[PDB]
Structure formats: structure tokens, C-alpha cells
Design a protein around this ligand. Structure first.
Ligand SMILES: *C(=N)[C@H](C[C@@H]1CCNC1=O)NC(=O)[C@@H]1[C@@H]2[C@H](CN1C(=O)[C@@H](NC(=O)C(F)(F)F)C(C)(C)C)C2(C)C
Ligand SMILES: *C(=N)[C@H](C[C@@H]1CCNC1=O)NC(=O)[C@@H]1[C@@H]2[C@H](CN1C(=O)[C@@H](NC(=O)C(F)(F)F)C(C)(C)C)C2(C)C
Lengths: 302, 302
């Protein structure tokens, strides 16, 4: 029993982290086979970051201008290219610690583990949800760029995020491993703001199933609701519409607990309309939306 | 910016996890050099766990009765001994992935990362504080025993916990790596309960400094307090006495922010007496006590 925000074991990703230095800018890179992937703004000076022309800055760099270090070993750069907002550095040595991997573009509402790194060295790991506004609530200081987000499925690492920047309110933005940003952000130091966020309904429902499994059942009412009436009520509380695809994804938790999804929707409807009356659910005084149905199943059945 | 509950990168510990099977009981072991450490109740059947005589059960086991598997390799057990509540299995192969390590007994109020494992396979990582009642708020299912807690200092892993059992309310108990339990618990399946817990004052203060660094400063009042008056007020809210050793440990955060510890104590005193008036601090509606001053410094200065 117990329910905690849990990250994937980071070992497979730790073995891929390297330091990339270009001139006087240093950040992290991800070394998979003979390629190192890193944010393209490693080629900028502080001044260039205000309004960079990456294509122009890159044409004046050669392979030798990129210094890649993996522990106490310098890797020789033998090729370079830019793909969207990431640079790919071909190196003369394939990473022997390369796990089985894939690059995936995650959807809003999904979670992943972040391995925060500085100077190519892993410092910590934590779980994030890709918010509906395409930001994550991370924790990153100067030099964290190139830190990656991932999921692990059996032996396979699905890399989904690479860190690039921090937005107002202390939220974070980045790209997939093909360098395409999540959200309408650009890698330039200019005024940018995230759009208004929304609560991930299907995740709040998943976390209510986690609470039931853990013995916190006070919020369970005796009613049911229709999907339409639930979505009409939940819209005013800035909750995402719950789709039939979301109801299907909640099926395993619903079957495990014997609580129909629409019955849990009636319990959530009452919690939204009446509040929690000073009570907690899994120790929280607020409804949590950063656990997916898979995250819950992972911990509440194995 | 940002502040998240963050675990240490688990790679160094993942390379030490093995599966230990004795008869029909399976749990996790920690393989360091040529020794595998695991909870002694691996030698029990379900029936033995109700009231076990470990010394008696162990005398009827030989080395061959312990099957240790590290990935796809079976390790041969060539010696065994029991030290308090842990069994030590000498194996014929030294773990080549053994990091630099030490065994430490952590103090109440301190935090560590837990690598939850099943069948010798790491599943997830999360941060815990050793509560003043010597329990942790973990997340463990059947088969999790032998999962370990640790801290990482530069290249050195300090192992401090090995998981043994779950107590009422879904809290967890275990031993140090010398097999001595934290708290007045025993490894027997009989009615046991944790003592009344207390709030770790120095950690709440550390987390208020984290909030200030992150720009959440609404709770800062214009007053100071004496240590005696702070401790008189905080006793009724079930907060641990704040000692001069705790005030000294908060020194780096106090110097970084320019807020004296006793001034933060006056702000905490007002929060305890008046509540948070529906407001949040670092997104939380409750005061958090599971971040040590070191955990805060780690994230709010690097
Ligand atoms: C990469 N190492 C850093 C990570 C930042 C540093 C503070 N916390 C983080 O997550 N990335 C940057 O410094 C990027 C980088 C230029 C400026 N920048 C920012 O994150 C800035 N943000 C923005 O300009 C904004 F709001 F548009 F997102 C900063 C004000 C420094 C936080 C580039 C190329 C975008
Ligand atoms: C080790 N694999 C498990 C981990 C437990 C299983 C459920 N969640 C966990 O943390 N440890 C045990 O099953 C230990 C083991 C016998 C019984 N036990 C317990 O944790 C039980 N608890 C107690 O009897 C109590 F309350 F005293 F702590 C159980 C009721 C199964 C949760 C031994 C030898 C203590």
C-alpha cells in the first residue's frame, strides 16, 4: 500500500548523459549510439540568445568547435547537423551503454520522468505531466538544458522531452527528441507566456481510483451521472472534457475496484461542487491531476 | 526555478539489485562486492512469518537453498550468516558494478531515495523522510522487501534503509544495512503500530526558504521571535522542538536569502496560529516537512 509520485529508475538514461561545450556555453547532451543530441542554443553566446539566427551561427562552427565529454573521456565530433531546435553531433565512438530506445512525442496529460543534469552529470529525478498548455512543472537551474524526459517500458526507454527554457511562473518548456517544441514556444530569450492551463480530468479520476485502492473512500457518493452531465458541470471548474477514449483507458481501474467510471464521475462532480470540507485524499488537500491511469495501475496492482 | 520532490539518480543502486529466492519465498537483495544483503524473512514460509524463530529456520538452510539471480546470471552462494534482521549471502562473484559505498544509520527527519524493486528488478524511485516515529511514507506492494533507501554524495552511495514491512495506515518500516530496525518494530506478522508522529520543524523552515527563493513570499511577516517563544507556540501544533543545531543547519539558507532563522520562525508561528487562509505555498495547501535544508540547497542554489 501507499501512493507516491514515483519516477522511473534512471540508470539507463544516466549512462547516456554527456557534457557539450561550444565556445563558452555548456549544457547537457544525450549520447545514443554515435550521436549526441543537445539543444541548439549551445552555439549561442548570451547576446545571441536574445534574437538568434541559428542557421547563421551554425555555419560558422566546424566539428572541432564542439567539445563532448562523457565522464573522463573526450568524444571526438566528426559530423554535425541541426534538426529543428536540436543539434545532432556525430561522434567517433558509439555509446556502449545505449539502451534499447525510441523517440516519442507525448500527448498532453501524459507523464514522464525527468533526469535533471548539470555539466553532463545527473543530479536528480522527478516525475512531470505534460500540461494541456504544453508546459511542465519542473525544477531546473542554469545549465539544465539538454536534461531529458522519458518513460521506460520493460527494457525500452522512450525519450519524449529535452529541456530548453523556463517561462513566467517557474514553468518549463522544451522539445521532443526531433527538436520540435511542445507548445507555441520558441528558443529565443524574449517575452513568452504559457496559455491558460486546464485540469487533466482523466488523471484526477485515476488518482481517485488510487485513493479507493488505498482505503480513502469517504468521497464515494451513492450516485451515477451521464458523461454529458459530468462534462457540463466540470467545464466551469476548468476541467478538460472527459472523452469516451478516457473512459476506456480508466476501464482496468474501474474493473479492479468494481466502481464504474461514471459513478466515480458523480463522486468527482460532488467534490468539485462542494469542495473537500477540509478533508484530504491520499494526504492531499487539493485534487491531483499528475498521475495517469497507467501510473496508478503501476503502483496499485503492479 | 521550480521546486519538486526529487530523488537521487538511481543507476548506481540499480546495478546492485538482485533477486533472492529461498524455497518458495522471493524478495530483493543488494549485491555489493561478493555479498548479497537481504531481509532475513526470505527464509520463512507464510506460516513461519506469524511467529518465526529465525535462528532455528536458518540452521536448517545450507548455501544451496539460496538462489540468487542477477539479471540472466545465477550467482552461487558460498557462505551465509545473519546479522540482526538481515541475511548476508557470500557469493562466488564480486559485483563489478559495485559503486563506492557506505552503510549509514540515518537520523529521524533526514531524507533518502527509495528504489522500489520486485523480483530483483527496479520499478521506481521516490524520496522519503524518516519520520520522528521511525516510519516512512512509502509505496510498496508484495515482494518489495529488500528494496533499499540511499543518498548519493558525489560518487558515494550511502545506503541507509532496507524495506521489511508495512504498518497500519499504509506506512512502512525497515532496517539499516546492519539489520537493526528503525523504531520499536520487529519482523514478525503480529499487531504493531507506529507511535504518534511529529512534524519536522527544521524541514518546514527549509521548505519556507525554498518558497522565498521561488518567489512565494506572502507569508513573510515583519516580526522576529526568540527560540524559546517559538518552541512554546509550536509545541501545541505537534511540531518538534527547534534546536540550536537545527538553527545552525539552516544558516546557509538564511544567509542566501538574508532572512534570519528566528524571523522565519516568526513567520511560521503566524502560519501555525492563523492558518494559510486558503492560500498555497509552492502549490501546497499544507506545510511540508519532508525536505531537509540540504534538499533545499541542492535545488535552490545547486
Ligand atoms: C538551459 N540551460 C536554460 C534553462 C533555464 C535557466 C533557468 N531555468 C531554466 O529552465 N535555458 C535558458 O536559459 C533559455 C535559453 C535562452 C533563455 N532561456 C530561458 O529559459 C529564459 N526564458 C525565456 O526567455 C522565456 F521566458 F521566453 F522562456 C530565462 C529568462 C533565462 C529563464 C534560450 C535560448 C531560450
Ligand atoms: C516484503 N516483501 C513485504 C512488504 C509488505 C507487503 C505489503 N506492503 C509491504 O510493505 N513485507 C511483509 O509482508 C512483512 C513480513 C511479514 C508480514 N509483513 C508485513 O508487512 C505485514 N505487516 C505486519 O505484520 C505489521 F503490521 F506488523 F507490520 C503485512 C500485514 C503483510 C503488511 C514480515 C516477516 C514482518
Amino acid at each position: 500500500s501507499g501512493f507516491r509520485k514515483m519516477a522511473f529508475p534512471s540508470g539507463k538514461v544516466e549512462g547516456c548523459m554527456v557534457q557539450v561545450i561550444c565556445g563558452t556555453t555548456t549544457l547537457n547532451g544525450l549520447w545514443l549510439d554515435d550521436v549526441v543530441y543537445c539543444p541548439r542554443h549551445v552555439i549561442c553566446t548570451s547576446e545571441d540568445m536574445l534574437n538568434p539566427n541559428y542557421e547563421d551561427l551554425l555555419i560558422r562552427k566546424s566539428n572541432h568547435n564542439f567539445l563532448v565529454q562523457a565522464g573522463n573521456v573526450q568524444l571526438r565530433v566528426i559530423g554535425h547537423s541541426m534538426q529543428n531546435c536540436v543539434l545532432k553531433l556525430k561522434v567517433d565512438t558509439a555509446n556502449p551503454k545505449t539502451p534499447k530506445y525510441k523517440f516519442v512525442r507525448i500527448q498532453p496529460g501524459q507523464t514522464f520522468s525527468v533526469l535533471a543534469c548539470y555539466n553532463g552529470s545527473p543530479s536528480g529525478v522527478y516525475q512531470c505531466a505534460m500540461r494541456p498548455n504544453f508546459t511542465i512543472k519542473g525544477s531546473f537551474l542554469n545549465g539544465a538544458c539538454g536534461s531529458v524526459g522519458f518513460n521506460i517500458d520493460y527494457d525500452c526507454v522512450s525519450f519524449c522531452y529535452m529541456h530548453h527554457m523556463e517561462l513566467p511562473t517557474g514553468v518549463h518548456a522544451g522539445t521532443d527528441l526531433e527538436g520540435n517544441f511542445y507548445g507555441p514556444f520558441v528558443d529565443r530569450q524574449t517575452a513568452q507566456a504559457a496559455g491558460t492551463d486546464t485540469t487533466i480530468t482523466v488523471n484526477v479520476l485515476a488518482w481517485l481510483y488510487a485513493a479507493v485502492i488505498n482505503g480513502d473512500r469517504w468521497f464515494l457518493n451513492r450516485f451515477t451521472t451521464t458523461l454529458n452531465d459530468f462534462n457540463l458541470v466540470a467545464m466551469k471548474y476548468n476541467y478538460e472534457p472527459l472523452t469516451q477514449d478516457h473512459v476506456d483507458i480508466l476501464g482496468p481501474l474501474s474493473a479492479q475496484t468494481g466502481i464504474a467510471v461514471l459513478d466515480m464521475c458523480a463522486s468527482l462532480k460532488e467534490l468539485l461542487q462542494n469542495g473537500m470540507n477540509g478533508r484530504t485524499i491520499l494526504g492531499s488537500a487539493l485534487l491531483e491531476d499528475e498521475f495517469t491511469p497507467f501510473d496508478v495501475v503501476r503502483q496499485c496492482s503492479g
